[PDB]
Each structure stands twice: as C-alpha cells, then as structure tokens.
Amino acid sequence: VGAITTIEDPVLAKKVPETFPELKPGESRHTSDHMSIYKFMGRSHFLCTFTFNSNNKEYTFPITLSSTSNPPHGLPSTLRWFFNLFQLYRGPLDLTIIITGATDVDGMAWFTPVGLAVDTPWVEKESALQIDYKTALGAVRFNTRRTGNIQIRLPWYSYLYAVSGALDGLGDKTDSTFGLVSIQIANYNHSDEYLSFSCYLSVTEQSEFYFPRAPLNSNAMLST
Amino acid sequence: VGAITTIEDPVLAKKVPETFPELKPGESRHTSDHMSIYKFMGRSHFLCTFTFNSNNKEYTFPITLSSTSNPPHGLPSTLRWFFNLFQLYRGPLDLTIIITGATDVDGMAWFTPVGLAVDTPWVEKESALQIDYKTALGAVRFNTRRTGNIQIRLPWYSYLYAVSGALDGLGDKTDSTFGLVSIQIANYNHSDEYLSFSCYLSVTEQSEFYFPRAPLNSNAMLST
Amino acid sequence: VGAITTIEDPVLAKKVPETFPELKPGESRHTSDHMSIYKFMGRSHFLCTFTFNSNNKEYTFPITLSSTSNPPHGLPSTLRWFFNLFQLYRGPLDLTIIITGATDVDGMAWFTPVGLAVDTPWVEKESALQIDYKTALGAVRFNTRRTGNIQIRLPWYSYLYAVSGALDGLGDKTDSTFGLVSIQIANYNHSDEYLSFSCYLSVTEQSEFYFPRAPLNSNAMLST
Amino acid sequence: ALASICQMFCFWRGDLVFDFQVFPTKYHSGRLLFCFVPGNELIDVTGITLKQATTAPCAVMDIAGVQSTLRFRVPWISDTPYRVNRYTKEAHQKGEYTAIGKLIVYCYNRLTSPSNVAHHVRVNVYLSAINLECFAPLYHAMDVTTQ
Amino acid sequence: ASYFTSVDQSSVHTAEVGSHQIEPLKTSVDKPGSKKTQGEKFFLIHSARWLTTHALFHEVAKLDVVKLLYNEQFAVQGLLRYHTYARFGIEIQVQINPTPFQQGGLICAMVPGDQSYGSIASLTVYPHGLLNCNINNVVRIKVPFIYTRGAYHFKDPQYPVWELTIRVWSELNIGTGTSAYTSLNVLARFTDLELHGLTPLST
Amino acid sequence: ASYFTSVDQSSVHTAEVGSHQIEPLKTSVDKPGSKKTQGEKFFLIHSARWLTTHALFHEVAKLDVVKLLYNEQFAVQGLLRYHTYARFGIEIQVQINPTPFQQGGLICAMVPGDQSYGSIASLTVYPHGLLNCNINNVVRIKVPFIYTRGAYHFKDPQYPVWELTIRVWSELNIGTGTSAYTSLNVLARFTDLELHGLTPLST
C-alpha cells in the first residue's frame, strides 16, 4: 500500500515507502560508520600553500568560509564543498601545518581575531606590526630543524553568534571570515633550498552545524 | 469556521455565523424593549379623518385591511405598512377618536359587523336606518361639550376564522373587512365653526398575528 | 494645630481645619434639606414663551443646553445657571406647559429626537410635516377649554452617551441639543383674545450629573 | 426585510451579517477579498490600493467548491453606542452618521476559465442582522440607494 | 483567529522547521517592546517661558492635550495612526525651575471640553495643582476619561477632550538683577489605553 | 518604572479624580487593539502573474521578505519604525488559482541569506511546499529565526534574513483557448515578535 502517496502534502511525506517484498539487510560489517560528520570531516583536509622568496618576510592568510573567493585564494576541494552544505558554523577548529625544505629556520605563528588591525590578507610583505603587539595576542615559536610540523587548535573568538558560508556583498565581506593565521620567518638567510609551507584544516568535536542548505552545483567546486 | 456555509441547504442555514473575534455586547440600557410588536403597535396610529358640512348627516367608514384601497380611503401610513407584514389577524382592536371645533354637539356612534345591512362605506348621507335598528347593535351616545374624545374597544365579531390583508378580487371584497364604525351627529345647527373628527387605531394584548409575509415595496406605502 | 497647612500639597488639603474652640451647632430645625440637588431643582423653573398670531401655524423649539445661545432664545435665569455647573447630563426631564387666553383651541404636541427631520428651531411657520409623520413619533392631543396645562415627561432618546452644556463650535451645534418639542394649534379662528403659552422645565429623580465645573461669571447670567 | 423593519425606527445597533453567494460552475477558479473599513460613510474609499487593504479586517474566499456561500459578520465598531437614521432629515451634518463604515470587494486573483463556459460569475449579496436593538419609532419611506 | 480570515476548500498543513529557541545568553537585556512600554511612556508637550510681564490671570500656555500627542514625532504615533477609535485616561507633569530669590505662582487646571465662560477664580474646582516658588516645582494630575460619546476619533474629532490651561496665579516679581524668567515644561502620557477599529485609510 | 525616569527632590503626590470605569454597554465589541492583534496579522507582499512563456526553472517572483514588510503601508510599520532591533519568526502563504483544464506546478522555497550558488534541483532541501493544479492551491511555510547576529537591524541591515524564491517546477501548458495565466499572491506575518531599542532617530 505504501507505493502510492501525495508528496504535495507534507504530512504524508513522512510515510515509510514500501514497494516490493524485502528482508532486513543484516548489519554493516565494519564497526565505525563513515557517515557521521565528526568522522568524515574528522579526517583533515587541504587548505592552502605558500612559499617564501626572501628572508624576514611575513605572510598572512585569513580563513574565509565565503563561497565567492575562488582558489588559489579561498577554500579548495573538500572544505569549499563542506562548508557550503550548512548555513552556520561555530566552535573551534584544529589546524595542522607542515614545513618542508630548508632547515634551521626559526618562525613565530600567531592568531588574529576578525576585525582587529592586521596585515593585509593574501599578501607577502615585511611585517608592519610592533613586536610587542604580536606576542600579546599569543603565539607559538617553532624551529624547523626539530619538528617541521605543528598541530594547534584555533579558538573561537568572534563578536558574531556564528559564521556563515553563503552570503552576498556587504555581509560576505565581514561575517564570512573566521580569523587570521600568520607566520613570520627569521634566519632564512640563504635564498636557496626553497622553504615552503602547507596547511590542513580539520573539524573538532566541539563544533556545531545548523540548518542544512543545498549542495553546490558542479561548476562551483574547484581545485588548485 | 463559521464563516463558510451552504445556504442552498436549509439545515446548515440555522448555523450560528462567526467571522472575527468578538465580545458579548453587554446589555441594553433602557428597561423596555421597542421590538416587541405589542409595544411598537401598542402606540396608537393614524387612521382617517372626515368633516360634516350640514346638520343631521350621518357618516360611515369600514375598517378595511386590504392593500388595494388607496388613501384617502384606506389604511394610511403605518397601519397600511403594519397589516401587510403578516397574513392573518384576529382579536379585538382599541379605537380612539378625537373631536375638534364646534361645541354642544350630541352624537351617537355604533359598530356594525361585516355583511349586515349598513350605510354605504365612505359616503356622507342622511341615515337610512331605523332608529330602533341602531341602538340594538349597541351604541355610545356622546356630547362634544364635556369630553371631545372617546376610547373604545371594537369587539371581534365575524363569521371568518380570521381576516387577511393580502387578497385579490373576489376574496378581497369580503374577507378583508373587519367591521364598520359609524357616527351620527345631531344639533349641529349653525353650519359655522367647522366640526371635524379624527380616528386612531391601536392593537390590543389579545390580538394575534400569523405567518409572516414580505414587506411592501416602497411604491406601495403612501400618506394622506 | 489645624490652623496651619500647606495647600500646595493636596494630601494635607483634606485635613479638618480648626481655629478657635467651638461647639457642635445642634441640628437644623426643618426636616427637609434644601441643598440636595433633586430638591432645589425639584422645583420647576422657567424656560420659554411664545404667542401665535394666526390660525393653523405650528411652533417648534429645541431644548438646548448650550451656553452660547443667549435668551430670548436659549436657557434663561436658573436653568442657564444650573446646567453649566456640571459637565454632563443624562436621563429624562419633566416638562410642564401652561396655556392662557383664548378658549376652545385644539392642539397636538409631539417630541422629536435630535437629528431627525423636523421644523426649523425658533421659527413660527405652517407645518411642513406629513400628518402621518407626526403621530408616529407619538403625540398628545389637548384642548384648551378643559385643562389649559399639561405636565409630561420627556424621554431620553439620543445616540450620545450624554449631553454637555459647555462646548465650542463644531461640537456645540450637535451634542448640546437634548431634543425638540413642538406644538401645533388648530381652530384658532378669531385672531383676537391672544392665545399664549409658557413652558416650565424640571429635573427628575432618574437624572444624573457628572464632573462638577466652575460656575458662570456674572456677565453670563441673563434674563428675558 | 431588514430594511423595512429599521425604516420605521430612529436608532439601531448590532451586527449586520452579509452573506455572499457565488453562482459559478465547478470549472471556474478565483478569489475575492472583502475588506471592512470602519468609519462613517462619507469618507473617501476609492483611493485605497489592494496592498493597503489587507491591514483592515478581511476574509479571502474561493469560488470553486461545494460551499458557495460566505457568512461575513461585521463586528459593531463605533464611537457612539447608537447610530441614527438621517435620511428623514434633509442634509448632512458632521458627527451624525448612519453607516458604521464601508465594505469593499476586491478582485484578489483574476478569473480563469476555459472557452466553452461563460467568463463572468455573478454574485448575490444577502443581508441580515443579529443582536439587533432599536427604539424611537417613526414613519419613513426609505428610497433606494443607487450608484 | 485574529482578523484576516482565510476561507478555503483545498488547504493543507504547514511545514515547520525547528521551533522557538530561548536565549542562554541574551543580546539585549531590556524588556521586549510592547504596547505598555510604548504608548504609556512620558512624552513632552509644550515648552514656554514665564516672564514678569505677564499680568494676573494672563494665560501662559493654552494647550490641547490629545491634538498635541498625535504627531509623527512621538512613537505613540505608531499605534494611534492605524486605529480609528480610542478611549483612555491622561496624566500630566508640569515642571518649572524657580530660583528661591523669586516669588509667585501658577495654576494648572485640566478642563474637559473647553473653558467656555465660567469664572477664572474658580479654577480650583477642576482637578488642579499649585506651583509656588516657596514649596514645590512639580505637580501630577491624573484624570479619567470624560466625553460625550463612546470614544475619541482622531481623523476628525468632534471637540478636544482635555484642553489644558495654565493661568498666572500671582504676579511674578524679582529684585534687582535677578534672573527675570524661568523655563516651563509639560509632560503627558496615556493610561490604560484601549484601541479599536483598524484601518488603512489613514494613509 | 518604564523608561522615562524622573529624579526629583521636591516632588509631591498626584491628584486623581474618579477612576477607571468598566462599560456596562460597550461601544465597540472587538478586542482592544494591542501588539498581538497588530504585528501578527497577515499582510500582502508580492502579486505577480504566472504565464506559459516562463521556461523551466525560470524565476517568477524573487522576494526579500523583511525588506518588503517594512513600509508605510502596513500597520506593522507602527512598531518597527520606532524600534532599532528585532528578532522573530516568519510564516508564509502562497495562493494561486488554477483552472483544472491547466497543468503544471511551482515551488516556494524559503532560503536564508541568499541562494548564492547551490543547485536549483535541490530546493526541496530547504523548507518548501509544492503547488500543483491537481492537488492544492495553497501552501503554509513557517520558519524560525536564522541569522549571523543576535537581532535584525532595520535602518541599515547587514544582509536580508529570509529571501524567498519561487521557481517554475514544471512548464505551464494549456489547450486551445483556455485562459493562459493565473494570479499569484504571497502573504506573510511576523511571529512571536520581540522588540528592543527605542529611538527617535528614525525621524
């Protein structure tokens, strides 16, 4: 009987459809499930990459959930796909960056909340900020010889209830930015050996997601 | 929910209509009601008027509930309107007549049931009836010097179950007459000073009314 | 101690003033009191007067509580003073009129609620109304030979909550009228002997009074 | 009928219940909007658009169905407890009114229909009252109000 | 069921998503706005000067209360504009600022309808209060609703309900050099306000 | 204690006369006007035509809900104009009038913020309802409040809260001579409306 329904009436839309005779399809054989969001996005995913061409230059990139900004500057691949399925987001993120190439390089990375005075996004230039201004916001000082990779949790500091990935114009310039991560290099002296970085973003267990949207039409998804 | 109904179905026609939210409109502030028939028509209303141009002439008028007879001979104003709302009538009436002008005038008024030998209606002529025939039917003898007004109850004497105001042709000439009231004047000797009469009809508490009709189209109602 | 107070503070304004030593001044020797309104205005007071100069002319006057209309057309003497002490009024009135001079005069007086089609106020002219229109509103038919005086209670019929005596302009033309009383004369034939009327208004026990005003400055009170 | 009862009276109050009766086929479709506009009857009602009308109380009706009749009950709204019969008196006066306000009937959706049926649906308007009070009788002949 | 009433054959259940959420951390801590917080607040009416050149029983400020409260300026305009009929009570503030080197006094009387004739010296009959440089600079008057109909009508009102008046009760006087004037203010609010009769026609 | 707050040394008791009277005979029998009777009623938004020349996935009416509800026309303008911040839910009516000789269908989807990119064919994910000439001419959609701040700001809003969209779900078609169009209407009301932030500056 369940093979006929009126979908123009939403009350009958929650009916359990039946068509032919069936059996219960047993169980799933592997223990964990892969459809829980906190697992699928539990895996880390790609974010961005940049290289330094000279000593004592500082680099800065925002983490922008906007759909409008197209890669190489923006969210590529999966993240661009994942943050557009749902309307809102809040809660911390787990950031992992990976160092390659040259060695014996000191560096100090900090995190800057949205709106505060900070270097221009996606621009590689000498730092304009007072050294006293940097360490106040908090920072980690890392050397490339010993580790070469850093896994650190970005906090949630914002004056917004939450951040959104689908916006247009005047709103998209403000609400859609999560925060800025910056990396300064020092003692790069030889310009050879090609020091390069890469970032990887992950989602925590304290993150939330709200109000499912529609997925992106194929011409939207891109790659670097 | 009461804002929708099918009036082509009489069972649902007795439904209590509701449209918007409402409150009970308190009370009426004056004690008596004016929509009870025995009150509205409790007030007296106009009937007819006539004047005598010479001594020892007798006048006679029927009380006719017919709609066909147009004033000055017929029912004017309110009565013409009131006796056409309902189909039937029965029971006594309260008659009040008022005398004006000349003084020291004896008069004798009687009441004649329908059908019996009587003077021609709406005609002012010398009495054709035996003086012995008058007082038998009953009469009141009044003098104009002392009173000048008389309030007397017409009885219900008829061979009909009831009388009707809406009739046509052969029926309207017979059933539609309630009875005849006549007034004879004597000792009018000086033709000056202009003796004149007026009647006023009222409805009793013993009257009845049956089977509501439709009210009269405006071209019907008239005035003297 | 009661000889000192602050009248700028209304709470202490209800204090019982004492100044010198006193005794209770016994009793009032006559039983009834004259300061109860329903007694002082229980007495009747003057209203208006008019005379008829020819036969079959009709006269009409409104009862207007307005202060603006100055006598001879308006409220004279006491009434003009009494209806301006308080803001509002409602409830029936007791009207008494008195006939003088010529005799054997039929007349019919009626009462017309405010706003309905009626003769022009304070104008003596032949009646413009259908005789069928008069008796419907109700009327009393009186002869001057027998009585010569009539005491009749005007009803309260109005679409206003109450009527007011102090008004200006657009309001004073409408709200301030209680109702219209009219008197038609008939059989006045000899123009001699000077038939004249007078009215007297009284207040009932069902009347009310609201919100005391300030009494009238002396240049206001007038006489006919 | 309701007229011939009140044409003899000065004052009244209550709720006038209009009953709108459509006479369509089953194949027409469309809606109407009955917009009640409290006030007096001398106000200018014509300069009102459709969007401005949904503010005032209204009811939207559908033409197709097995219910052809809409009962619409005007709640009594006035500054004075009783209205009055001015038609006896000759001319207008400020503050003395008869109606409690005007009714409007818009065209909310257009009227669609195939070729083989008539394109216009006549609608009768009934009238009757409830909680009706009266007083102060008189005699009057109320002329047809035309337009 | 409020006012707009749909009568339909074909209708259907609505589709909700989620539901009203209470705030564990509030954005704004003030009471949620409503009629009682809007209509009933204090509003300013008339502001004039009181000078020594005003003789006895001169009229400093003659006000029409309801006519002044209805204006685009005051947020109570929001309700009154879309409602045809109203009835209500009124409250009044009269605040002045004497310097104790001055002397004199005023009277503030709420008269229903109009003053018309009746005596000036009797204004102490009407609900009133007295300003004096000796005692107090403030009065509060609160009067219920008085009128000859059921309710007020804002588009074309019959006659002004409460027409406030202020007379100089004793001539103002000062010494040599003392400030010769004082400010004067009036405040008013509706009370227990009740509305009826929605309508577009105001626009 | 509401908002306007007097702080005075010299103050005094007010002088009442009479007191609030209930009506033994009411002048108007409708509920006394208030917020719940004003703000929450149904209002009209957009009225357009739906024609056969509209291809598949053509957009009949693109609406901005909150921007349209705020206008001098609708009496809800009364409250919103004098309040700076608000939060609220929305309800939606979409009413059309098919004649059964026609065929086709529409979709009415409430999208928060903007559509932006995401697929048209997925609009059945958003809270929605389907119009069809076979079944029903009416849909009701009711959505709670979604936004990236605490409350909406009417003077200079960041981005439109609920921007409603309507796409043609299947091409309209008729026979020979049949009426080629149909009316289309949209209704909306605020729900559980809460206000804050009084202010003159709107005028």
mmCIF file with all atom_site columns, C-alpha atoms in Angstrom, chain A residues 108-184:
data_model
loop_
_atom_site.group_PDB
_atom_site.id
_atom_site.type_symbol
_atom_site.label_atom_id
_atom_site.label_alt_id
_atom_site.label_comp_id
_atom_site.label_asym_id
_atom_site.label_entity_id
_atom_site.label_seq_id
_atom_site.pdbx_PDB_ins_code
_atom_site.Cartn_x
_atom_site.Cartn_y
_atom_site.Cartn_z
_atom_site.occupancy
_atom_site.B_iso_or_equiv
_atom_site.pdbx_formal_charge
_atom_site.auth_seq_id
_atom_site.auth_comp_id
_atom_site.auth_asym_id
_atom_site.auth_atom_id
_atom_site.pdbx_PDB_model_num
ATOM 1  C CA . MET A 1 108 ? 56.609 32.528 15.099 1.00 0.00 ? 108 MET A CA 1
ATOM 2  C CA . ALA A 1 109 ? 52.956 31.987 14.218 1.00 0.00 ? 109 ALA A CA 1
ATOM 3  C CA . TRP A 1 110 ? 50.091 33.876 15.819 1.00 0.00 ? 110 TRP A CA 1
ATOM 4  C CA . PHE A 1 111 ? 46.308 34.037 15.536 1.00 0.00 ? 111 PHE A CA 1
ATOM 5  C CA . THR A 1 112 ? 44.400 37.281 14.997 1.00 0.00 ? 112 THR A CA 1
ATOM 6  C CA . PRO A 1 113 ? 40.634 37.573 15.614 1.00 0.00 ? 113 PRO A CA 1
ATOM 7  C CA . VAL A 1 114 ? 38.443 39.150 12.965 1.00 0.00 ? 114 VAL A CA 1
ATOM 8  C CA . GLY A 1 115 ? 38.379 42.912 12.568 1.00 0.00 ? 115 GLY A CA 1
ATOM 9  C CA . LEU A 1 116 ? 41.485 43.788 14.558 1.00 0.00 ? 116 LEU A CA 1
ATOM 10 C CA . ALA A 1 117 ? 44.409 45.594 12.962 1.00 0.00 ? 117 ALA A CA 1
ATOM 11 C CA . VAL A 1 118 ? 46.353 43.007 10.996 1.00 0.00 ? 118 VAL A CA 1
ATOM 12 C CA . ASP A 1 119 ? 48.398 42.569 7.841  1.00 0.00 ? 119 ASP A CA 1
ATOM 13 C CA . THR A 1 120 ? 46.606 42.608 4.516  1.00 0.00 ? 120 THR A CA 1
ATOM 14 C CA . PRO A 1 121 ? 45.258 39.150 3.613  1.00 0.00 ? 121 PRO A CA 1
ATOM 15 C CA . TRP A 1 122 ? 46.940 37.088 0.899  1.00 0.00 ? 122 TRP A CA 1
ATOM 16 C CA . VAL A 1 123 ? 49.943 39.439 0.749  1.00 0.00 ? 123 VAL A CA 1
ATOM 17 C CA . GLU A 1 124 ? 53.573 38.537 1.409  1.00 0.00 ? 124 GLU A CA 1
ATOM 18 C CA . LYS A 1 125 ? 55.334 41.588 2.830  1.00 0.00 ? 125 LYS A CA 1
ATOM 19 C CA . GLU A 1 126 ? 57.587 42.669 5.666  1.00 0.00 ? 126 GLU A CA 1
ATOM 20 C CA . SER A 1 127 ? 55.735 42.764 8.977  1.00 0.00 ? 127 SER A CA 1
ATOM 21 C CA . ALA A 1 128 ? 54.191 46.139 9.829  1.00 0.00 ? 128 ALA A CA 1
ATOM 22 C CA . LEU A 1 129 ? 53.290 45.212 13.411 1.00 0.00 ? 129 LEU A CA 1
ATOM 23 C CA . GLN A 1 130 ? 55.144 46.056 16.587 1.00 0.00 ? 130 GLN A CA 1
ATOM 24 C CA . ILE A 1 131 ? 56.930 43.025 18.020 1.00 0.00 ? 131 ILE A CA 1
ATOM 25 C CA . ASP A 1 132 ? 55.192 43.903 21.284 1.00 0.00 ? 132 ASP A CA 1
ATOM 26 C CA . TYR A 1 133 ? 51.813 43.673 19.562 1.00 0.00 ? 133 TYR A CA 1
ATOM 27 C CA . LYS A 1 134 ? 52.418 40.152 18.282 1.00 0.00 ? 134 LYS A CA 1
ATOM 28 C CA . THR A 1 135 ? 53.154 38.138 21.408 1.00 0.00 ? 135 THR A CA 1
ATOM 29 C CA . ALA A 1 136 ? 50.290 39.748 23.302 1.00 0.00 ? 136 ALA A CA 1
ATOM 30 C CA . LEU A 1 137 ? 47.695 38.090 21.063 1.00 0.00 ? 137 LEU A CA 1
ATOM 31 C CA . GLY A 1 138 ? 49.537 34.847 21.810 1.00 0.00 ? 138 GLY A CA 1
ATOM 32 C CA . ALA A 1 139 ? 51.916 32.959 19.554 1.00 0.00 ? 139 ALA A CA 1
ATOM 33 C CA . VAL A 1 140 ? 53.972 29.818 19.220 1.00 0.00 ? 140 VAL A CA 1
ATOM 34 C CA . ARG A 1 141 ? 57.647 29.992 18.316 1.00 0.00 ? 141 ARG A CA 1
ATOM 35 C CA . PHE A 1 142 ? 58.794 26.965 16.328 1.00 0.00 ? 142 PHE A CA 1
ATOM 36 C CA . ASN A 1 143 ? 62.057 25.838 14.775 1.00 0.00 ? 143 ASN A CA 1
ATOM 37 C CA . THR A 1 144 ? 62.110 23.854 11.542 1.00 0.00 ? 144 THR A CA 1
ATOM 38 C CA . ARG A 1 145 ? 65.124 21.693 12.399 1.00 0.00 ? 145 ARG A CA 1
ATOM 39 C CA . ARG A 1 146 ? 63.446 19.799 15.222 1.00 0.00 ? 146 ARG A CA 1
ATOM 40 C CA . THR A 1 147 ? 59.794 19.383 14.240 1.00 0.00 ? 147 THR A CA 1
ATOM 41 C CA . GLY A 1 148 ? 58.703 20.744 10.868 1.00 0.00 ? 148 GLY A CA 1
ATOM 42 C CA . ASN A 1 149 ? 55.011 20.234 11.640 1.00 0.00 ? 149 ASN A CA 1
ATOM 43 C CA . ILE A 1 150 ? 52.605 21.814 14.108 1.00 0.00 ? 150 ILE A CA 1
ATOM 44 C CA . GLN A 1 151 ? 49.104 20.799 15.153 1.00 0.00 ? 151 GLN A CA 1
ATOM 45 C CA . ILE A 1 152 ? 47.292 23.543 17.003 1.00 0.00 ? 152 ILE A CA 1
ATOM 46 C CA . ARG A 1 153 ? 43.672 24.324 17.855 1.00 0.00 ? 153 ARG A CA 1
ATOM 47 C CA . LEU A 1 154 ? 42.322 27.645 16.687 1.00 0.00 ? 154 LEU A CA 1
ATOM 48 C CA . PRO A 1 155 ? 39.985 29.139 19.306 1.00 0.00 ? 155 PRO A CA 1
ATOM 49 C CA . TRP A 1 156 ? 36.567 30.614 18.664 1.00 0.00 ? 156 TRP A CA 1
ATOM 50 C CA . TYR A 1 157 ? 36.825 34.346 19.305 1.00 0.00 ? 157 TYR A CA 1
ATOM 51 C CA . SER A 1 158 ? 34.290 36.473 17.462 1.00 0.00 ? 158 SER A CA 1
ATOM 52 C CA . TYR A 1 159 ? 31.583 39.040 18.113 1.00 0.00 ? 159 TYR A CA 1
ATOM 53 C CA . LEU A 1 160 ? 29.159 37.077 15.937 1.00 0.00 ? 160 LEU A CA 1
ATOM 54 C CA . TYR A 1 161 ? 26.787 34.404 17.121 1.00 0.00 ? 161 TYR A CA 1
ATOM 55 C CA . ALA A 1 162 ? 28.143 32.235 14.307 1.00 0.00 ? 162 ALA A CA 1
ATOM 56 C CA . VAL A 1 163 ? 29.679 32.449 10.835 1.00 0.00 ? 163 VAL A CA 1
ATOM 57 C CA . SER A 1 164 ? 28.090 31.629 7.516  1.00 0.00 ? 164 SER A CA 1
ATOM 58 C CA . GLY A 1 165 ? 29.355 30.393 4.179  1.00 0.00 ? 165 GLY A CA 1
ATOM 59 C CA . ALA A 1 166 ? 26.600 31.688 1.888  1.00 0.00 ? 166 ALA A CA 1
ATOM 60 C CA . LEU A 1 167 ? 26.487 35.482 1.711  1.00 0.00 ? 167 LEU A CA 1
ATOM 61 C CA . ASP A 1 168 ? 26.456 38.271 -0.855 1.00 0.00 ? 168 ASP A CA 1
ATOM 62 C CA . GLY A 1 169 ? 28.087 41.684 -0.925 1.00 0.00 ? 169 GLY A CA 1
ATOM 63 C CA . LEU A 1 170 ? 28.102 43.821 2.194  1.00 0.00 ? 170 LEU A CA 1
ATOM 64 C CA . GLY A 1 171 ? 27.598 40.883 4.535  1.00 0.00 ? 171 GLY A CA 1
ATOM 65 C CA . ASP A 1 172 ? 30.040 38.485 2.887  1.00 0.00 ? 172 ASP A CA 1
ATOM 66 C CA . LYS A 1 173 ? 32.948 40.856 3.491  1.00 0.00 ? 173 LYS A CA 1
ATOM 67 C CA . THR A 1 174 ? 32.532 40.779 7.285  1.00 0.00 ? 174 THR A CA 1
ATOM 68 C CA . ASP A 1 175 ? 30.622 37.806 8.746  1.00 0.00 ? 175 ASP A CA 1
ATOM 69 C CA . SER A 1 176 ? 32.230 35.212 6.498  1.00 0.00 ? 176 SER A CA 1
ATOM 70 C CA . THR A 1 177 ? 35.762 35.415 7.951  1.00 0.00 ? 177 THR A CA 1
ATOM 71 C CA . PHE A 1 178 ? 36.666 33.106 10.816 1.00 0.00 ? 178 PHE A CA 1
ATOM 72 C CA . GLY A 1 179 ? 40.038 34.590 11.721 1.00 0.00 ? 179 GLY A CA 1
ATOM 73 C CA . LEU A 1 180 ? 43.569 35.161 10.510 1.00 0.00 ? 180 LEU A CA 1
ATOM 74 C CA . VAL A 1 181 ? 46.632 32.957 10.947 1.00 0.00 ? 181 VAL A CA 1
ATOM 75 C CA . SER A 1 182 ? 50.043 34.444 10.235 1.00 0.00 ? 182 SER A CA 1
ATOM 76 C CA . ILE A 1 183 ? 53.536 33.051 10.032 1.00 0.00 ? 183 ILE A CA 1
ATOM 77 C CA . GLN A 1 184 ? 56.768 35.016 10.290 1.00 0.00 ? 184 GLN A CA 1
#
